[PDB]
Amino acid sequence: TALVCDNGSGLVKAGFAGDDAPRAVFPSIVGRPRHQGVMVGMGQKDSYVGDEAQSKRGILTLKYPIEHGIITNWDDMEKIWHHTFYNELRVAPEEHPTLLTEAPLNPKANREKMTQIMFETFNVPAMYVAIQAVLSLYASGRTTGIVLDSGDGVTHNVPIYEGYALPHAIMRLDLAGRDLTDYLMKILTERGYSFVTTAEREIVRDIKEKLCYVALDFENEMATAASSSSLEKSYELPDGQVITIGNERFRCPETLFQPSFIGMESAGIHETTYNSIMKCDIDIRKDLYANNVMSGGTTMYPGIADRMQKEITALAPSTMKIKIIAPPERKYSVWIGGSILASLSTFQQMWITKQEYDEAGPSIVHRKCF
Amino acid sequence: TALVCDNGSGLVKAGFAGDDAPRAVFPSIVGRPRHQGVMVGMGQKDSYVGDEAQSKRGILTLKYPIEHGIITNWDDMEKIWHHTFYNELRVAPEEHPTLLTEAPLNPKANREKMTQIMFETFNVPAMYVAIQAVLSLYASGRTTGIVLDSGDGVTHNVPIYEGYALPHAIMRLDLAGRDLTDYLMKILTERGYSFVTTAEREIVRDIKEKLCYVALDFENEMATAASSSSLEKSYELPDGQVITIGNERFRCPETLFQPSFIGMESAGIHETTYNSIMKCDIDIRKDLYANNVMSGGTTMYPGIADRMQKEITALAPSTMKIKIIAPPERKYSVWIGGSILASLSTFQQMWITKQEYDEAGPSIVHRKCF
Amino acid sequence: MSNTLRPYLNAVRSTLTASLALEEFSSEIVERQSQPEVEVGRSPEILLKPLVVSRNEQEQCLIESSVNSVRFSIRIKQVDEIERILVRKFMQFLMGRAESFFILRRKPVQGYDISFLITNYHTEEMLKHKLVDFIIEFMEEVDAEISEMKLFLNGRARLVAETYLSCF
Amino acid sequence: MLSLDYNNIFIYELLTERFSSENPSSIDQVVTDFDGVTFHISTPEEKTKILISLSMKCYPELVNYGTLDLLKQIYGAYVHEPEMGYNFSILIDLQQLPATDEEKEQLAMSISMLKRNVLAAPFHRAFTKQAELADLARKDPENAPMLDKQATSQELMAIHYRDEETIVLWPEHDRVTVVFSTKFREETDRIFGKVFLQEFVDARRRPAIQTAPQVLFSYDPPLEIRDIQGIQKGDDFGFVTFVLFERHFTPQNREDCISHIQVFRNTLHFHIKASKAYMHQRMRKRVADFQKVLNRAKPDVELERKTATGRSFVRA
Amino acid sequence: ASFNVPIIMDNGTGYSKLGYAGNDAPSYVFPTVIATRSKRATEDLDFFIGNDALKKASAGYSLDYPIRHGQIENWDHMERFWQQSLFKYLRCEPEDHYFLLTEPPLNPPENRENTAEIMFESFNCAGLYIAVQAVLALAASWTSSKVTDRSLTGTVVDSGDGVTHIIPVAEGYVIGSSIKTMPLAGRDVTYFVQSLLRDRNEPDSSLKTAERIKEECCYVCPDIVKEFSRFDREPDRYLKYASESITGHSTTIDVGFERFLAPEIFFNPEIASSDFLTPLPELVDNVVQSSPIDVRKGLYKNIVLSGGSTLFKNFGNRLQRDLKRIVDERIHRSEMLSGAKSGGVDVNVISHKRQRNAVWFGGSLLAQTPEFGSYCHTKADYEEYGASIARRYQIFGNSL
Amino acid sequence: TFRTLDVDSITEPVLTEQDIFPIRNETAEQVQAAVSQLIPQARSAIQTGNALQGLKTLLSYVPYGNDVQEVRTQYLNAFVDVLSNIRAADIPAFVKECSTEEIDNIVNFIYRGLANPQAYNSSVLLNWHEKVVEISGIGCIVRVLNSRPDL
Ligand SMILES: Nc1ncnc2c1ncn2[C@@H]1O[C@H](COP(=O)(O)OP(=O)(O)O)[C@@H](O)[C@H]1O
Ligand SMILES: Nc1ncnc2c1ncn2[C@@H]1O[C@H](COP(=O)(O)OP(=O)(O)O)[C@@H](O)[C@H]1O
Ligand SMILES: Nc1ncnc2c1ncn2[C@@H]1O[C@H](COP(=O)(O)OP(=O)(O)O)[C@@H](O)[C@H]1O
Ligand code: BEF
Ligand code: BEF
Ligand code: BEF
Ligand SMILES: [Mg+2]
Ligand SMILES: [Mg+2]
Ligand SMILES: [Mg+2]
């Protein structure tokens, strides 16, 4: 067995290769206390990690060590990996290879320090660093398609044909569920309700995860919510009081299809997918159009597969069929795909091994993992 | 049963003597992946050949190993013979004597090396290297006639009377269906369709096959198409985009009659046929005009028989019959003629046999073949 | 490949599937030991008659059989000295891996190119219809594998010829 | 490596050490080379003085073709009495050594270049005599064929430079022709050697490499070498001929061309060995795909979950 | 037989030493490393080896070491390493020369078979001898090749970069029932020096810097709990080492208790492995006591050291004193039961001038002997029996 | 040394093939006469074109024994010659009408013809092998594996 540790920017998703689904899913958060620690003894800790922080958050400054899929704070990222292996999986990491992941078009130094900490702190016996939108394509049961992965921090497209990636046609967009959370705070502020702190940012994430949905036709949905009760509904806070919301429920997800709302100049996710298909060689485009693959938690909004199929069918030539593949387990497909990969018998030849790291130094990942 | 291959400069035609048509017809292509394989488990393969390369082409750089009827990349030609023997016909080359086919006025080195490979790499029991135009008279059932063969790589006339060829009156022209694809790619740019890659070349080869024709008078057809949409057609690319095509529908095949379009200084196929007949002895011309035989895929354009009869009737003396026999099987008529020749009772003494080759070396071929 | 070997490989497939009727058998000459009786040959009543199947003087199979073991040995096409070297070496890689192709011998029987030993334990713990499909799919493809290697040898003979000759 | 070095690497590295060294140690080093050649490097009188010496079975022939004047031109003051058991010897003093690091570099190169400087003498005799015939032929183009005919039999060099070879060369007013009467005695190299020599001739007949010498091949000898000693037609030799035209040994090219033609048979000998190293890596690729054809005979069972060292594990 | 100087190749896990028999040093000593890539196919021509393949890590080649724990274990890489050794560096013709190759005592028969088929079928060499490497290293001890200077009885302790093994030899015969082997040597102590620099988080801990800190700074102390205590009392023992990075800039490394705790891997191999628990002085006593009784005075009297990883400052004296302690304690138990005295046994551990490459100098000195062409596998025997001619162990007792 | 001296061959006499298969009752000259009368009937059946009645009569008796190679080879020469002279479309009409005893005599001798390709054309024997096994089933090879070794 080998660990598969998809340290995403919003959730760590971890477990064992060939296991059905990730067994350690928790916030990619380190919390530190912000108040007068008056009661002596009491089992107090200098910092808290994951669900241990999320449940204590009313006294903590929660901060994610990872932003837009790039590690910003290594002293806390080691704290998350240590929590993953010793507290959440309860293994010794020196006994198991780890398949890690990262998004494409990351800094070189991210990939180096992430191999160095696995070999020099966690003492791991072998490791590998897969591209997240390649893994999501194993989890679809395919060898050609265009994975749209979108998580908490990054959205990216990787077009693949016959198992060859077309790396010139990879699109990264630094917009995903954390920007939709920050935008939901900016529009909730307009109805009556103020959310400000790093802990209140989790309450509005827990709104976004169950009140929001994607409108199939935003400009007509906007007129319908401005003229009826049916689109409005309510959520009950930790403080027992009720929050009622309406056109905020679909204006939030719409930022993915209209990044101009949060001040970005870019294509939306629909036109970013088409700009990746139209960068590919002309003979493969039909087999990409019939195999768009949704992945990552930001693709979980009710109606996003219907909307994505509508917007791509308007951009694509009407002569040919579009399919969006969106399984119900697309919430974890990058982990699911790493759990396939780390169990394929040729894969056991591809690991960076401890001995090979010791001899080659941390630059070995650049001449073995892609 | 003997084999017969017409190793065409763009399609391989291969089969067994006494069959009515080729057993296997496939592009004379070898392709290598241009991109990086990211999937494991996939059957990654270092080269594809024939129809598999034509099918996977969106990720391949495609090479033709024969240029103007001359083999120019021997390694990718040995791959194609190994594909004809072990994959397409799926018979071992040692079991059957084998008729190969070649254009007139080729390098001596081309026919020697093609003999040395067949006896010392494919170990064949016997072989013969017939001239492609001499086989077109067998297919047409003639013993007197002037052939006009035109393939992917080359166009040539061989005038023949009562089975005696006139090798001083052979005209050979390195202009045929490849240079018409290269020119159609160029003039397609003037309507705005940029085709550039070795795989987009195979889309523009298909446009040329599906839509082009030879117009009975070019200045009249130009003045027609300049006024009207009635001569236009539309073709759906494998992308689902539709191109629409104008006077370049017939300005492409006119290159055969006006080589100055592609900058080269030579007589078009009409004048080069008339010059071949005017080089011949005066008593035989009167029969060469009556038995003018076409062959090879570049002679398949709609209206090319009527264009060719109109032009030869304008050149040749009006007092006698011009009669062009372009049969409906002419696409394969070199192979069909080879399958007749290799089947004759009187030909079975004419093979170069292995025991007769290795006492003389590959220079035996020039003293048994034409 | 197939169509020229089709008469031969249907004779080999049919002989080899009729030959692979193996059983557990404790040896009669030694106590508390089983041994592959085709390979030891010390008790004759549990050997079956050795059958040859054959297309040509070059291309042959010898099939030897016993109550708990079958030995199968083949000569493949070697029509020039380049195929003699390429075959003789290719089979030494293929038998050098015998610990992971469980049915291979590490040495051929004398005068054969490669040899297989399908013991009772293999027909209990492996799919015996996929064992004969591997023997047959090896005999179809090995002529295409070796002929391709003599193309790559010509390809390098050109690589070094052009690279030497083009720097005068 | 794709093509052989012309110099002996060991003597280059060794002299590059001692020419840099602040404190030389003593040495006694016999050092083999191709074509049966052998060097001896030693410090016989002092650690300060290096004697380099050369042994080569055909050196008595090379002295007939003017070798000593070429070696005295190149090595000058460093030439020494031949060491007992060796054909030629040079004594270089590490305290009397040249001044600059680029003088040291080109002297360490020049001394390591000894095998191709001793075997160059018949080539310089042919190139410099072709320069005389090129002027005489330019004085009378109708006499020129007869000057070529007599130089083809009177000015011919033959060197029995190893026992399974002969290099034969002669000047004519527009060329130097050189013929290798070449044989591979090791039978697995003779079998590949047919492919390597055949594809070498067939390579010259392609548009890409027309700029090269005209190579030709046979197995009987070229008409002008049919009565040279040791050339025999029946003994399974092959006769690779290069025709070097005036453009293949123009003054900028001569030294590379001499260096590069001597090494001919050694590149084929090296590439025959280095082709077995290729065929093996291509064989063990097809073995690894026949593994898949057997793997479909193993029934599907999950082998139990284990730690990296193979010890058993208890999770999932 | 050919008369040409036999070629000698000690392919170590760390360094290959190459040369010709009868020379006074190896022609080359360079790392056993190959640099490889990670319309004709040439990725098997583009490789480099030795000192010229360290220069290639920045040019995008992957370096790999085809010998690990004293055994060849990548045969594609080792075949390319030999062709390049023979045709670039040694610049020889294999068909003219006999070759002496070396391997550890406990190598698998499969590796001698693969070595023989590569030498006889790929290179076609005239003949081959595959010497057990520590059996040669005794012959580097002699003051000269001449018969009166020989001392053909002695234990030989060999420790390179990848294996240590102790071979007893007596009256010129290798006592094969008594060989001891432990795959812990110069590289495993480098990974330990590297592991310590890395736990202190020093600016550089690349393999080349731990390899240099071993041979610059480390030594074998008497006892590590007193040496840790000395590093508190005696603060000039914390050396400062200046290292230059892969990318060409300065650094400074403090070197600490790895100055003694790293060479201690030989005298307490529990520090390195769970599997090889027996320390080198007791591993030597297990050799000499397993050996037949009459040779034991001779085997202790002459314990030859060999191979680069025996060169640590004070290594010979630690081995001599800890072995003398084991030996005189055992003799004094025997004096106790008897009440009589004994003459004891002298234990000498012999460090000497050729200790850095002793196996090569041993191979060179043996291969000069007129008999050597008769001990080789000649290629005539290879053409008769095939590569199985090399499969039999010369050293151990064989059934059949 | 003693380890290599075999004793089993001289203290534990093993079975012989004539213990496992009953010995032939007909004497060598009695079968050599019985075959030499049949081969002319088979040679004649080829010369009159009725080659299929040649096989039916030739296959009515079979020679076997370690004493008779010089006539087992003549019987095999006549049998391979008769198999090479039957039209391939007549084979399915012959094989479906053979008894299981005659079939087990055909396939037994085609595996003797396939053992000597330098004297027999394998291509026609492999064609008979496909047709006899496809029509009569795989057990007809199993009866050859199990058959007498001096056939
Ligand atoms: N049902 C849902 N509806 C909308 N957003 C969701 C839903 N489920 C998860 N998300 C969002 O997905 C993000 C986490 O997705 P994930 O794929 O695990 O990201 P990452 O890999 O970067 O950690 C968070 O922003 C979370 O709120
Ligand atoms: N129906 C067609 N109409 C026009 N061009 C054709 C047609 N069929 C084939 N061609 C062209 O003819 C060429 C192939 O003809 P072929 O006789 O097989 O040439 P070759 O023998 O040299 O390979 C290609 O350029 C192909 O595009
Ligand atoms: N002075 C020294 N002190 C300690 N180790 C040394 C010294 N000099 C070299 N070494 C070590 O010796 C080893 C190489 O020894 P060698 O005999 O060549 O081993 P091998 O044969 O296995 O390659 C390396 O670990 C090297 O760092
Ligand atoms: F980091 Be998550 F994939 F956005
Ligand atoms: F062979 Be094609 F006719 F050039
Ligand atoms: F490989 Be070294 F000899 F330890
Ligand atoms: Mg993610
Ligand atoms: Mg053609
Ligand atoms: Mg060593």
Numbering used by the authors:
A (entry chain O), B (entry chain Q): 6 to 375
C (entry chain F): 1 to 168
D (entry chain D): 1 to 219, 221 to 317
E (entry chain A): 2 to 39, 66 to 427
F (entry chain G): 2 to 152
Provide text from the study.
Arp2/3 complex is composed of seven protein subunits and nucleates the formation of actin filament branches on the sides of preexisting “mother” actin filaments. Elongation of these branched actin filament networks powers eukaryotic cell and organelle movements. Like actin, Arp2/3 complex is an ATPase. ATP hydrolysis and release of the γ-phosphate from Arp2 and/or Arp3 regulate the turnover and mechanical stability of branched filament networks.
We stabilized the structure of the branch junction, corresponding to an ADP-Pi intermediate state of the Arp2/3 complex, by including 2 mM BeSO4 and 10 mM NaF in the buffer during daughter filament formation. A second structure at 3.2 Å resolution has the phosphate analog BeFx bound with ADP in the active sites of Arp3 and ATP bound to Arp2. We reconstructed the branch junction with ADP-BeFx from ~200,000 particles in 8500 cryo-electron micrographs. The map of Arp3 has clear density corresponding to BeFx in the ATP γ-phosphate position. Compared with the ADP reference structure, the branch junction with ADP-BeFx has a 2° rotation of the outer domain of Arp3 places subdomain 2 (SD2) 0.8 Å closer to the mother filament and buries more surface area between Arp3 and actin subunits in both the mother and daughter filaments. The net bending between subunits M2-M5 is ~1.5° in the ADP-BeFx branch compared with ~2.1° in the ADP branch. Overtwisting is less pronounced (0.6°) in the ADP-BeFx branch compared with 0.9° in the ADP branch. Arp3 buries slightly more surface area (1524 Å2) on daughter filament subunit D1 with ADP-BeFx bound to both Arp3 and actin D1 than with bound ADP (1415 Å2). With ADP-BeFx a hydrogen-bonding network stabilizes the D1—Arp3 interface that is lost due to twisting of Arp3 without phosphate.
